[PDB]
Structure formats: C-alpha cells, structure tokens
Design an enzyme around this catalytic site. Structure first.
Site, PDB file in Angstrom:
ATOM      1  N   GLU A   1     -14.138  -0.999   5.330  1.00 25.43           N
ATOM      2  CA  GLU A   1     -14.503  -1.128   3.909  1.00 25.43           C
ATOM      3  C   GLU A   1     -15.948  -1.606   3.746  1.00 25.43           C
ATOM      4  OE1 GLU A   1      -9.895  -1.902   2.514  1.00 25.43           O
ATOM      5  OE2 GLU A   1     -11.172  -3.603   3.200  1.00 25.43           O
TER       6      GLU A   1
ATOM      7  N   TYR B   1      -9.240  -9.408  -1.525  1.00 29.97           N
ATOM      8  CA  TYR B   1     -10.227  -8.379  -2.008  1.00 29.97           C
ATOM      9  C   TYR B   1     -10.913  -8.862  -3.284  1.00 29.97           C
ATOM     10  CZ  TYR B   1      -8.732  -4.682   1.266  1.00 29.97           C
ATOM     11  OH  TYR B   1      -8.459  -3.851   2.374  1.00 29.97           O
TER      12      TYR B   1
ATOM     13  N   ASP C   1       0.838  -1.186   0.000  1.00 26.97           N
ATOM     14  CA  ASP C   1       0.000   0.000   0.000  1.00 26.97           C
ATOM     15  C   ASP C   1       0.877   1.241   0.000  1.00 26.97           C
ATOM     16  OD1 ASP C   1      -2.512  -1.078   2.452  1.00 26.97           O
ATOM     17  OD2 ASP C   1      -2.166  -1.747   0.392  1.00 26.97           O
TER      18      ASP C   1
END
Ligand SMILES: O=C(NCc1cccc(F)c1Cl)[C@H]1C[C@@H](O)[C@@H](O)C1
Length: 660
Positions: free
Chosen positions: A502, A614, A231
């Site tokens: 999320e 994800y 990230d």
C-alpha cells in the site's frame, strides 16, 4: 432526577467507598449509570465502578464496570447463588488523550429488567447490547453491601485498582430510553462521518479516504462493509460523503459503487470465536477506494477494486486478467451457464460475441454490466443473510434485481479474478456515474493489480493523474493525462515477494514525486520519480518509524505552508512493532539540497496502546489537518466486527509541532 450524583473523584490506585451515599437508594430492577471519566494512564485492567458482596466466601458476587489499557470497556455481572457469571465487553471503546489533554469519556450503561437487556454506550456510540434468558438486576446480586469507585471490594480487599478520574457519576433507578441516551451532553474529541444505521445500512466501515477538492469541499470515500469487517469475499459497497464547512458537518452518504445481488442489511456480525469467521461468500463486492480531482475536466475520479461473486484476494485467479487481447483492444470475457470455459466476449456497443462461431448473440451488456436479451432486462433473485439457525445462511429473499455479470446467479459470468474500476463525478460527489473497468495492464495471464487506498495524485504543473497500485514484485502506477479516459502503467520494481505494498504519493516539488509504502520489513519504504512518474528510483527506508512485520497502510500529504521555514510532508501511520496502535502524524522537513526529508516532529493521536490502523489525511481549506482513521486494531482477531471505530478529528499544525 438521578437518584444519586457526585464528581471530582481522583482514582489513584485507591478505592473510594460510596456505600452510604448509594446503597439505600438502589431500588427496583433497572438501573442506568452515567459516568464522565478520564484515564490517560490506565493500569492494564481496572474497575471504574463496583457494587459487591464484600463478605468472605462471596468473592464472585459483584457487578463491575471495567476497562483495559487497550481501550476495551466492559461489565461483569456475577452472582454465585444464582449460578450467573455474565461478562459483556468491547475492545477499542475509549479515548485516552487528544491534543495533549485527557479526554472526558462519557459512558452510559443501561441495565433493563423489562427487556432483559444490558447496553453500553461510550461517547455516544453503542458498543454492546445483549439480551439474556435469565436477567440479573445489578441491585439483586445476593448480599451486596459495598459500592466502590476505582476498584471492586471482594472479601474486604481491593481488586482491579484504577488510575484515572471520575469527573461525574450519576445513577438512575430506571433503564433510560435510547432517545434519552442521545440527549446526554458529550465531550468527544472526534466526530463520525459514516456510521451504523446511516443511509448505507452497513453496520461496518473500513478503509477511509479524504481529499480536499479545489472548491474547498472535502470529500471522503470508504468501504461500507456489510458481512462484518472482513475483506472480500463479502458484500462491500463504496460510499462517499463530503463537507462544505472545513469538516464540521458531513453529508448523508451516497454510493459511488454498489452491487445489488445481496440486500443492504444492517447486521450485528457475531463476535464469538466459533462464528466470527462467518463470511458472506456468495456476493460481489468492491474494496479499497482512492480518489483524485482532475483540474482539466474539473471531474472527481474514484477508483476501487471489483470482486465478482464469492471472490476476494485469496481465491482470485492469479493467472488470468479476465480480458481477451485482440490487436491493441481488450474485451471482457464471459462464460455462459453450463459451459466449462469462456466462449464469449463483450464487444463494442456491449454486443456479446461467441468466440467459437465468431458471430454476435442476442445478448448485450448495458452500462451497468447488466445482461440484456433482445434489448430486455434479465433478472435474478436477490439474497439476504441471517443467523436465525445458529450459523450464517445466505438465501434468496423474493426480490428480483437486474442480472449482472459479476453475480453468482447470472447467465453470463466474468472471470473469477479481481479488477480495477473507475467512476467519476461531475458535481463534486453529489452523484457518481456507472463504473467502468479499467483495461488490464500486465497482459492476459495476470490478475488485476491492487489499488492503493486513499488518494490519487494530481500533478501541480500538468494535468497528469496518477493512481498507485501494487502487485507481486512491484508498484504499478496507473497514469492518465486525458482525465481518466485512457491509462498507461509505469512499473517500479520492489524487493518484495507478495507484499501488501500500500503506497501513497506526495509531490515534493514540480515533477518530483515521493511514494511512501507499506512493506514486510517493519519499516515504511519510499522511492522517488523525477519525471512526473515515468520512472522510479530504487527503494529506501525510513528509520525512526516502526510498523509490525505485516505492516499497515500509511497516508501522506505535502503540506502547503512552510514549517520552520522549510517545505513539509506529513505522514499518518501507527508507530509500533506490536500491533496497529500508537497512531501518529509525523512531520518531515524537506532538505532542498537533495530532496531528503528530516523527520522532526511526531504527534501521538492517542495513547500508544490505543488502536490506530488505516488512515486518511488531508490539508483542510483553513490549513488544519483532517484525519479520518480506523480507531482499532484492524489486524487483531479479537477486534473484528466493531461498529463506529472509523472516526474523524481536526488538528492544527501547532498541535503537531510539539514534540520533537
Ligand atoms: O490541493 C492540494 N493541496 C493544497 C492545499 C490544500 C488545502 C489548502 C491549501 F491552501 C492548499 Cl494549497 C491537494 C489536495 C489533495 O487533497 C492533496 O492532498 C493535496
């Protein structure tokens, strides 16, 4: 032309000796093995193929192709008299099952003495390629006298017993070329949309999205990640691709959002434990995209987080929005090189204003956030990265690029914090406008909220657009009713400090939105709005699905057709308390009495022990379900910096509705 070839071998914890078919035929120092194999119930470590010295005292003289029940694939190449013990492997390299059937994996291992290189491919993906100083031909291991399937023979005993089947195995006494490798027929259950060596030149991808547009075009966005899979801080761009044929084929990617302070470089990021935290630390980046279509304007709208040079989640200034509020207006603040504070702001027409003298300067910022002086482009020098010296170096590379306020070398710089940007497309993802920063939503002393990756929500009966974002203590829904031109927030408190919450939304019925979201509790949570997102309920939890304590993004759609005569929601998530794995689609039927959901069917995307992180889901124009997802454990430190693990599959409802 293979020197040897056989097939239909059942591996039932019992090795098969093929010495007499193969050992006199191994010749020269270069070999390629092609193996088509199934393994839906593997042992936790098992050899598919062994060549060994089977004599007492030589147990460390052998070549093996092995796998683990985590989906890792690898080789050992060992010769005790040469002092060589090579082990090359990569996690998350295999498929187990797809639609209730064992997948035929196609493995290609090339042992090339001329280039002194070992390269492994699985399912048409190169998973490692290693050059050595001292090459060990697999046929030159001292005293080799056994060839085995489903084990390695060491000192006359079976080691690494396998469960599975080898439908086909061929051996060549040549290192077949890259191009030859690409002509071997595959039986892949997936395809690639973004991939290493495509137009983004990113060697890594993370954070997939999918959205079916009204035209029937299916659009996808993704982080194109350059500095390995890390990230931000890093170099990451937002790339997009679309399909016009229900996901059969995809367009070459383009950028929706990009920075040019660092070169787009395809880099093999190091996976050794000493170097794998290498992180690009001087680049601006974008991270976490989300897409929606506007019925009013017909535009497609894409949002992402924007990180100035060197900034990411954990060093972003948590107490500054980076804007100055002036009577209902927010102006981007700037700090000039040499000042200790932010003495400037960007006003109307991009005019850069000195807040100390209240007078305009001779600098302006254009629509690309580049710095102009008297109308003229200022430049900086671009950086590239290399590991030539043994560790990460970031360095000027001689090319000049427009000076941008998000860049480390800019004369004027924004606040070192995180922002949310938007772009729009007028032609359904064939090109994207220059991005614009959204306004701050939580005042001057609060960093940007974090965009929830995946889809925004376009309400069925109005023109209202909603993007979910999260921050400490709350979901922050961003709402536009005029095609993205202006925005307001609706905050919905959540009982979490510092959660990566999320969240993805489905419209259960007109004006009724249910949001599902990641938490720190091991359960997926949800809340409901009955007024198109103006206000939100308290939070509840789904029992029946497990996540880990740190959680994973969950994607969610409302399906357009009835299932068992009721309306249906589909969720996509790992289902496991151990790691990001055991990927599932879960089909819930809505109880019209109270808008409660009975989770009724769970479909396993692959084996419980195979990676699933994800994910993005969308109902295709033909009512199939498209799934683009990270097929690896994107939390695990052992699975960092893997290429071509974001993959796309196509499923039908009848695939999902066994079983209960
Ligand atoms: O238009 C949507 N769903 C409806 C839909 C998709 C595919 C085939 C259909 F007949 C319908 Cl109604 C939204 C598109 C976004 O991808 C949201 O997931 C649902």
């Amino acid at each position: 032309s293979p020197i040897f070839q056989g097939g239909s071998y059942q591996l039932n914890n019992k090795s098969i000796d093929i010495s007499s078919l193969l050992l006199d035929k191994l010749s020269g120092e270069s070999q390629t093995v092609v193996m088509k194999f199934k393994a839906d119930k593997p042992n936790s470590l098992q050899a598919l193929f062994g060549l060994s010295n089977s004599k007492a005292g030589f147990k460390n003289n052998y070549f093996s192709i092995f796998m683990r029940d985590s989906g890792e694939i690898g080789v050992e190449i060992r010769d005790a008299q040469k002092g060589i013990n090579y082990l090359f492997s990569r996690p998350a390299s295999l498929w187990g099952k797809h639609k209730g059937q064992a997948v035929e994996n196609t493995l290609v291992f090339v042992s090339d003495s001329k280039d002194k290189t070992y390269t492994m491919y699985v399912n048409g993906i190169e998973v490692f390629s290693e050059t050595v100083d001292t090459f060990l031909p697999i046929s030159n291991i001292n005293g080799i006298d056994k060839a085995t399937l489903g084990a390695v023979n060491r000192e006359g005993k079976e080691h690494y017993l396998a469960k599975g089947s080898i439908d086909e195995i061929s051996l060549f006494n040549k290192a077949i070329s890259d191009q030859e490798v690409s002509t071997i027929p595959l039986s892949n259950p997936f395809q690639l949309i973004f991939q290493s060596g495509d137009s983004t030149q990113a060697n890594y991808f993370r954070i997939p999205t999918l959205y079916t547009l009204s035209s029937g075009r299916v659009l996808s966005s993704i982080d194109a990640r350059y500095g390995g899979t890390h990230d931000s801080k890093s170099k990451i761009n937002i790339a997009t691709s679309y399909s016009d044929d229900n996901g059969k084929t995809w367009s070459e990617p383009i950028f929706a959002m990009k920075f040019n302070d660092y070169e787009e470089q395809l880099v093999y990021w190091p996976r050794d434990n000493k170097l794998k935290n290498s992180q690009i630390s001087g680049s601006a980046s974008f991270i976490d995209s989300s897409i929606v279509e506007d019925k009013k304007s017909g535009k497609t709208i894409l949002l992402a987080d924007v990180m100035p040079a060197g900034i990411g989640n954990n060093n972003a200034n948590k107490a500054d929005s980076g804007f100055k509020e002036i009577n209902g207006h927010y102006y981007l603040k700037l700090k000039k090189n040499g000042d200790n504070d932010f003495r400037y702001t960007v006003r109307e027409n991009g005019v850069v204003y000195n807040e100390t003298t209240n007078k305009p300067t001779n600098y302006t910022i254009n629509d690309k956030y580049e710095v102009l002086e008297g109308g003229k482009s200022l430049t900086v020098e671009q950086y590239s990265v290399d590991f030539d010296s043994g560790s990460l170096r970031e360095r000027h590379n001689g090319k000049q690029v427009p000076m941008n306020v998000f860049y480390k070398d800019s004369l004027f710089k924004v606040t070192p914090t995180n922002y949310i940007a938007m772009t729009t497309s007028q032609n359904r993802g064939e090109s994207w406008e220059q991005f614009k920063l959204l306004p701050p939503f939580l005042g001057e002393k609060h960093n940007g909220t974090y965009l929830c990756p995946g889809q925004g929500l376009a309400l069925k009966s109005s023109n209202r657009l909603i993007f979910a974002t999260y921050t400490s203590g709350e979901l922050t829904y961003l709402i536009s009713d005029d095609s993205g031109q202006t925005w307001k927030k609706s905050s919905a408190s959540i009982p979490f400090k510092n959660a990566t919450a999320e969240a993805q939304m489905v419209e259960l019925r007109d004006g009724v939105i249910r949001t599902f979201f990641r938490t720190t509790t091991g359960k997926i949570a949800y809340m409901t709005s009955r007024d198109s997102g103006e206000t939100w309920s308290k939070v509840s939890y789904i029992d029946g699905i497990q996540q880990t304590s740190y959680g994973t993004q969950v994607s969610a759609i409302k399906y357009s057709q009835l299932i068992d005569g009721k309306e249906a929601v589909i969720l996509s998530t790992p289902n496991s308390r151990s790691g990001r794995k055991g990927g599932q689609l879960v089909v819930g039927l809505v109880n019209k009495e109270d808008d409660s959901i009975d989770w009724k069917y769970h479909y396993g995307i692959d084996l419980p022990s195979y990676g699933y992180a994800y994910s993005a889901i969308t109902e295709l124009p033909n009512h199939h379900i498209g799934v683009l997802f990270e097929k690896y454990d994107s939390w695990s430190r052992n699975e960092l910096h893997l290429s071509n693990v974001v993959q796309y599959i196509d499923l039908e409802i009848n695939d999902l509705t066994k079983l209960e």
